[PDB]
Known about the structure:
2 copies of one chain form a homodimer.
Chain A: H1 3-18, E1 23-26, H2 31-44, E2 48-54, H3 62-73, E3 77-82, H4 84-90, H5 97-119, E4 123-125, E5 135-137, H6 145-154, H7 159-162, H8 182-201, E6 208-213, E7 218-221, E8 226-238, E9 246-247, H9 252-265, E10 269-275
Parallel strand pairs in A: 1-2, 1-4, 2-3, 4-5, 8-10
Antiparallel strand pairs in A: 6-8, 7-8, 8-9
Helix pairs in contact in A: 1-2, 2-6, 8-9
PDB class: ligase
Keywords: Pyrococcus horikoshii OT3, structural genomics, nppsfa, National Project on Protein Structural and Functional Analyses, RIKEN Structural Genomics/Proteomics Initiative, rsgi, ligase
Assembly: dimeric
Amino acid sequence: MDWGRFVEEKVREIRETVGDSKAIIALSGGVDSSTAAVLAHKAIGDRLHAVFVNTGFLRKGEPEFVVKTFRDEFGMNLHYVDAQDRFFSALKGVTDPEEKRKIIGRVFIEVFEEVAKKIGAEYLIQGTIAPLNLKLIEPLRDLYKDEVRELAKFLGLPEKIYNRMPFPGPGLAVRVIGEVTPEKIRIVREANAIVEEEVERAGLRPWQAFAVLLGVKTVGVQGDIRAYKETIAVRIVESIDGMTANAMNVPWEVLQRIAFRITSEIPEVGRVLYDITNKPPATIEFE
Amino acid sequence: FVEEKVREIRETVGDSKAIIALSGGVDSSTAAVLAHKAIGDRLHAVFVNTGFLRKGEPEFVVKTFRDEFGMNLHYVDAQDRFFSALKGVTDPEEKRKIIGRVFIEVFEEVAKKIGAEYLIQGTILKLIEPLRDLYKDEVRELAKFLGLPEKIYNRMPFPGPGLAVRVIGEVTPEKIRIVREANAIVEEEVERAGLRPWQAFAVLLGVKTVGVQGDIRAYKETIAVRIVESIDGMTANAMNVPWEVLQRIAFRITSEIPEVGRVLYDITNKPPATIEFE
């Protein structure tokens, strides 16, 4: 393979296509969109407008990391969009998993379209890989997943991105069973951070590792009196590419640390359960 | 000791009839055998099938006390009454309160027909408590000496409300059936693997999810497996169960109980969590 040649030719292609016009891209923080953004940025510089939407369902430290990486370090013309209120308000009273995803998808498009109209770009860059009135450009169209990761590394993207575990577009909203509220998202966000921290501390490299707020209540104690507490499910799986996946045989000490930290550092949680179901028969997420 | 207590009971009861509630627990069982050796045919044991007992449990109790020990055993099928009384009840406290109220109504109903004058209780009508001076460990030894099955004197504790508190939310016949089957799988695999925990059981969580086979839009149930080690039950730790055993439990539950599509294992100690979920 020759990545230097690939980059030179692809950057040239984007330049010849865009000309002096503006191009826009949705920056999700994922490896695909990140890689496509870097190629487009090398091609047209400030004429590339990278739009990053904070949905309110991102992981701890994620928004800050994306801004630091793309605005500060890569110097991209980034549009940080805080749309948290729109997403949370739109989900009020919605408990059905499918409906939640539908609403989140609709609001994301509404937000992106609103910002895009102000930008007035003529081209839309997408990180589509092999595996708005805008002309489409897909720089990674002929590349497979493993190749995109190699390219991302070659382009100087952080390992935190090219080796990241996949994370759903609706984010933490699908990690909360039932109605999505700021409090539930706060709890699962902290629990998720603990899960990832313990997996990292033990040098484990699973396909996915996350926490889910089940909605099931258990009787705990806060001060010196009984109170209802939440239940968190921990999901850690091993997989080649998600086709099938096995619940991971996590060292007991790691599971103990996760359970201890979640219930001690997040007083609102009183019980932690570990998912031991493979795929098949189960899905990886809890939807 | 046996000769002494049997003598005391025989002197207290005289030629009157006595009644005792058989729960299947070591305490009531041991007290029942002592009372039976004392007044034989004048002891009337009462077994109430609440509808929340474990798989094969009712049959075991009847076979053990009525056939094996030859006691007068009044079997009461009150499943319908308990399920009706719990219809729509979600609060754990109310479930326990209602089950207690119904048990009494059912028991007092059967006690009237017997016409007993003494009530035998396994506390550790006139009351008779032959084990009021014995501790948990002592009662177990006595049970062994009396000839009670190991399945009883060494059995894990099981709550009065039974499987009703092993179902989060409203209790219904179908939910109890599902958790009864899951519970049997958990106990079977834990025993087969040589595990000897304080308690090992299954809980129907109420949370539902879709799977990746067959009708992928059909929401299925979730079972939580609870296995803990404890000395006294005051403090306990989630057990470090061998992975292959947990995998077998998950496989059997989803393969044998089509209604369940997800299995979770509780990894929380006590404190901060309770052993039972409700």
